[PDB]
Design a protein around this ligand. Structure first.
Ligand SMILES: O=C1Cc2ccccc2[C@H](c2ccccc2)N1
Ligand SMILES: O=C1Cc2ccccc2[C@H](c2ccccc2)N1
Ligand SMILES: O=C1Cc2ccccc2[C@H](c2ccccc2)N1
Ligand SMILES: O=C1Cc2ccccc2[C@H](c2ccccc2)N1
Ligand SMILES: O=C1Cc2ccccc2[C@H](c2ccccc2)N1
Ligand SMILES: O=C1Cc2ccccc2[C@H](c2ccccc2)N1
Lengths: 219, 219, 219, 219, 219, 219
C-alpha cells in the first residue's frame, strides 16, 4: 500500500502477512456474503493495483466468480479507454505516461508507475479507480450468489418476529435492494410476510411505525 | 482513524486487520450484550465516519438491529440538520464546506472531507459526533434484546446469593437502569427478590447496608 | 494511554485491541483469583481514567463485583472531595480546572481534561490516583471471593508436602494475609496443619527453618 | 528484506517470524495449488536473494519439487551468464563487482553484496531477478502437480452449474491456460462439457454470452 | 522496560501484553523445568524492578515456590544492605538517593526512582541486580522440583541409546550439575548406566570418545 | 539483536516474544529435521552471542543433541584460540579487548562487550562467527538423527513416482549429500531404486533427462 510514514511523505510499504491472511480467511469462511465487500475495501486501504491483484489472486476457490470479476474489470477498463484515450508513440524522457485501463488494473503497469501516479501532485488515484471496478464486480457476484428471493422470506408460525426480521433484511442486503426500499419495505412486504398473529398486531399499529415499534409490538 | 504520528501531527491511518477482526468477533460471540458497546467505543478510538461505517458494515448477522440503527442515525442526522443548516449553492474555492447530517454519517462526505473537518483548527469532530449517534442506537438495541425484566430475577432456594446478585445486576445493566436505581435497588428490590432465608438476614441488617455487607451476610 | 512517543513528548494513544482482549480474557479465565490484580495493573500501564473505565466496562459477567467496585470508587471519590475541595463558579478562560473525585473517576471529565492533567508540569496523575482506588476495590473483591479459610487447609495423609504448601499459600494470598504473616506462618500454622508424619519431621527441625528446608525435609 | 525506513533511506531489515511462518504454513496447507504463487510473491516483497533462499529452504516436504526448482534456477543462472559475462580477475578496491547467476541466486554472494546491488543508484535488482526465476520454476511445479485435464471436467447430471464452472476454471488455472483461452473457453469447451439440460439452455443463448449470463441461465 | 527509542535516549516503555502472556503461559505449561529460567531472563530483557515484580506476581499457581523465592530475595537484599549501607536522614533536594535492598527489589522504590537509577550516568543497574537475585532463587526452585537423581537414570534393555542420553542430560540439567561434570560424565556414569549391550560397545571404544562417537557406536 | 533503527545507527534491541516462541515451537514440532536449520538462521538474524545462547537454552528436550552441540562449539572455540591468541594481562583503559573463543560463544563476555565488538568500525562480527559454529554443530545433529540410508529408499510397486522422489530427496537432504550428488543421483541411484515399471521407462529416456522429464515420464 501507499502510506504516510512517521514524517508525512507518501511511500510504498509491502502488504502485510496479517492483511494477506485476513483476506484469504474471510473468503474461506464467508464466501460472497455481502459483508465480505466492506471487509475487502477496508483490508485494501491504500492499495496499489499490484496489491489489489495480490489479494484477488491469493483466492484459491471460487474461480467462477473470479472469472466473472475479470469480465467486469475488462468492461470497466474498456470504458476508461473510451473516456481517456492515451497518446500512442514514445513517452517524453523521464516523464509520467498516462494510464490506460490495463495500467489501472495493474496488468500492463509496473509498481513504479503505479507509485508514480498515486504520489503525483495531484495524485492520479489508480488504486482507488481500480478498487471501484473490483467492488462493482464483487457486488454482481454477491447478487448472483444470493440464494433466496425476498418474496420467499415469510415468518414461520412459531418464529420469533426478530428472527424473521433478521432473515428478511439479510436477504434484502444480498439481493441488493436500495436503502429507499429497505426503509420502505417496513410499511409493506415485511408486514405482508409476517405470520397471521403478528400481521394482525402490525396492521393495527397504523402506518408510519418504526421498525423498533414493530419489533416491540410483536415481542 | 486519525492518530498523531511519532512527530505530533494528526494524520489518517488505515484501520488495522486486528481492529476489524476484533469487532466482527465480539459481535459474533456476544451479540448485543451491554458490554459490546464499550468495546465498540474503544475499538473505534479515533475513527473517521468512514471507519465507523466499515465497522458497522462488516457485521454479517443481526440485520434487524442494523436496520433499527440506520433509523436512529437518520433521526439524529435530521436533528443535526434542524440545528445546523448549511448554505446551499457553490462552495468557496479551496475552502471547507459545512457538514450536513449525512456528511457526519459518512454517506455523502469523502474521506478527504472528513479528514479536513477532523484536523481543522479547531476540529469539527465528525467522527465523535457520529459515534455518539451510533452508540445512542446501539443502546436502544441492547434494551430491545434484553430478554428478562428485573421483576423476574429472584433468588432460587439453593442459589448462592452472589450468583443471584450477578443475575440481578446483569439484568439491570441490559434493561438500562440509571446508576441512581442501581445504587438504590440494594435497599429494595434486591432484598425483596431474595430467597426467604437470605431475606430474613438482610431485613435484620438495617437500612444503609452496603452491597459488600449484604453479600457477606448471606455468604 | 499516555505514552512517550519516539521523540520524548507525552501523548495520548488509543488502547490497543490486544490490551482490550487480554483483559477480557483474563477475567473470563481467572475471575477474581488474586493474580488478576497485578495483571490489571500491568495491562493498564499509562491509562487515562477513560481507559480504566473502558477496561472495567468491557467486563460482561461478575456484575455483583462490578457494583461493589462502584461503591468503593464512590467512597474514595467522596474522600478525595473532603481532602481537596474545588472552587465553585466559572473557570479561568483557557486555564486548567481542579479535578473532583468524579473527574478522577472519568465520569465527569473529558479525555481532553484528563490528558491536560496528566501532561501538566508537574503532572496531576489522575490515571494513577484512579487506578489506586480501583485496585483497593478489586482487593476487597478478591478477599470476598476467596472460598476457603487458612484454618481449613490441612495436609492430607498421602498429599505431597509441596502440594499442601501450594494450597496453603494460595489460600493466604486470596485471604490477603500480610507478608509478616506469610513469613511467620512457616514456624506455626503450616506445621500445625501438616499431616502427622511430616509434622513430626518438621517439629524435629527446630525453630528458624526456612521453607526450603521444610520442603526438603518432608520430600 | 530491503525497506524504506520512516526517514526514506533503503535499508536491510530481518525477515519476520510472521513472514517465515506464513510461508511454511501456506505450503503445508496448499502444497502447489496455483494461488500459492501469488502468496509467495507477496510474502517475498522486498526480499534479498538471501531471504528468498530462506523461504525456499524452510520448506520441509516437497523435495522433488524443490529439486526441480533448483534445476530451473540453474538454467536461468546459466542464461544470465550467457547474456552478462563478468570480468575475471581482481575487483577494483572498494568498488562493486558485477553479479553472476549464482550471485543473483544468493549462493556465491554475501548479504552485503546483495544489499550493495539492490541499493546502488540505479539499483541492480538481484532480488527481483531471482524472484522471477523462482516463480518460473514454481509455475512449472504447479503445472506438474495439476492432477486433472480440462477435458475431464464435465458437469454431472445433478451438479449445480456454478459448482461445475468453479471446477472448470480451477482446472484451467492449474493447467496454466492463457487469459485468451480462459476468456474464449466460455463460447466452447465450457458449453460442451456441460450436462444435457444446461447445454440446451446455453446453446439457445446465442454466441457472445457473458459468463454471468450463462450462469444465470443455468441457475 | 527501559529501551532506547528510535532516536537513542533510554526511556520507559510499558510491559507488553505479549510479554505478560508469554510468561504466564510458559509457567503454566512448563512449571519449573530448567529451560523456564532462560525464558524468564529473555522475556525480562530491560525490565525495571516493577516489571520483574509484575511478572512474578502474575503467576497464579506455584505459591510454595513463590514463597521460597521471596525468602531468597530477602536474603540477597539483606546481603546488599550489609555491603552497601545508605545514609539515614533527609535526601538532598532534587538529588538521587542510594538504593537499599528493598529498593532494588521494587518494594520500597517508585518507578520514577527506578528509572532514575537505571538511566543515571553511569547506570545503577537495579533491574539487572534484582534479576540476578531472582534467577538465584529460581535455580534453587528448579533443583528442588527435579524429581530424579542421576543415579537412577539407567538405559532400559530395549531403550534406544539416544533416548537414554536425552533422559540423562535432562536430569543433569535439573539437578544442576556444572559443565565440568556434564563434559566429564561421558567417560563415566553415562557408560556405567548404559544397558549391557551398549556398555560393552562403549567400553571397547577407549577413553576420550566424544558423545557423538558414543552415540554412533550404540546406534 | 543488533538492528538499525529508523535513523541508521546500529543498536541493541531485546529478543522478541514472537521470536522466542517461534524457535521453541519449531524445535518441538520438527526436532532436527533439516529445514530447522535455515529456520534457526533466520530467526537469529542480527543476534548477539547472548541471544544465540538464549535460543539454545530455551530448548527443553533434546539434551543429548544440546550436549553434542556444546562439544562442537568447544572445538571451534579451541580452534579460534589457536588462530587468534589474545594478549594476557590488563586491558588498556577504556579500550576494546580482543575476543577469545569463549567470548564469541557468549560465556565469558558481557552483552556490552558483544555490542562493542559488533558495532565497532569495522565490526568484529562475534554473532556471525558464533552462529557459524552453532550451525556446524546443528548440521552434525541433523546427520546423526537422519534415520534412513539413501540405499534403502526404493519405490514401492504401487507408489507414485512423485512420492518416491520426495522420499528420496528428503533422505538425501538429511544425510547431507552435496548438491553435486543431488544433481547427479538423477542419472543413477534414483533410477536404480525405482520400481520395475518406471525403471524401464526411465532407462529408455536416455541420459541427460531432467528430473522434470523423469517425473513426467513416470506420471
Ligand atoms: O492479475 C490479475 C488477477 C485477478 C484475479 C482474479 C480476478 C481478476 C484479476 C485481475 C484481472 C486479470 C485479467 C483480466 C482482468 C482482471 N488481474
Ligand atoms: O454506510 C453505512 C453502513 C451502515 C451499516 C449498518 C448500520 C448503519 C449504517 C450507516 C447508515 C446507512 C444508511 C442510513 C443510515 C445509516 N451507513
Ligand atoms: O464508567 C464507569 C464504568 C465502571 C464499570 C464497572 C465498575 C465501575 C465503573 C466506574 C463507576 C461508575 C459509576 C460509579 C462508580 C464507578 N465508571
Ligand atoms: O540455497 C538455496 C536453497 C534452495 C532451496 C530449494 C530450492 C532451491 C534453492 C536454491 C538453489 C540451490 C542450489 C541450486 C539452485 C538453487 N538455493
Ligand atoms: O512484589 C513482589 C512480588 C513477588 C511475587 C513472587 C515472589 C516474590 C515477589 C517479590 C517479593 C515480595 C516480598 C518479599 C520478597 C520478594 N516482590
Ligand atoms: O550458554 C550456553 C547455552 C547452550 C545451550 C545448548 C547448547 C550450547 C550452549 C552454549 C555452550 C555452553 C557450554 C559449552 C559450550 C556451549 N552456551
Amino acid at each position: 500500500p501507499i502510506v504516510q510514514n512517521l514524517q508525512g511523505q507518501m511511500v510504498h510499504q509491502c502488504i502485510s502477512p496479517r492483511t494477506l491472511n485476513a483476506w484469504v480467511k474471510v473468503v474461506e469462511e464467508k464466501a460472497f456474503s455481502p459483508e465480505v465487500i466492506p471487509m475487502f475495501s477496508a483490508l485494501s486501504c491504500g492499495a496499489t493495483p499490484q496489491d489489489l491483484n495480490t489479494m484477488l489472486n491469493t483466492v484459491g476457490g471460487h474461480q467462477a466468480a473470479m472469472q466473472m470479476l475479470k469480465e467486469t474489470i475488462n468492461e470497466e477498463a474498456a470504458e476508461w479507454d473510451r473516456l481517456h484515450p492515451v497518446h500512442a508513440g514514445p513517452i517524453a524522457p523521464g516523464q509520467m505516461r498516462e494510464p490506460r485501463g490495463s495500467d489501472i488494473a495493474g496488468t500492463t503497469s509496473t509498481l513504479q508507475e503505479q507509485i508514480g501516479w498515486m504520489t503525483h501532485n495531484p495524485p492520479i488515484p489508480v488504486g482507488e479507480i481500480y478498487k471501484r471496478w473490483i467492488i462493482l464486480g464483487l457486488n454482481k457476484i454477491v447478487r448472483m450468489y444470493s440464494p433466496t428471493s425476498i418474496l420467499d422470506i415469510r415468518q414461520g408460525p412459531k418464529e420469533p418476529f426478530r428472527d424473521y426480521v433478521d432473515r428478511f433484511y439479510k436477504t434484502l442486503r444480498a439481493e441488493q435492494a436500495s436503502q429507499e426500499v429497505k426503509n420502505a419495505a417496513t410499511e409493506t412486504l415485511l408486514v405482508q410476510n409476517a405470520n397471521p398473529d403478528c400481521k394482525t398486531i402490525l396492521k393495527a399499529l397504523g402506518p408510519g411505525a418504526t421498525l423498533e415499534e414493530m419489533m416491540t409490538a410483536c415481542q
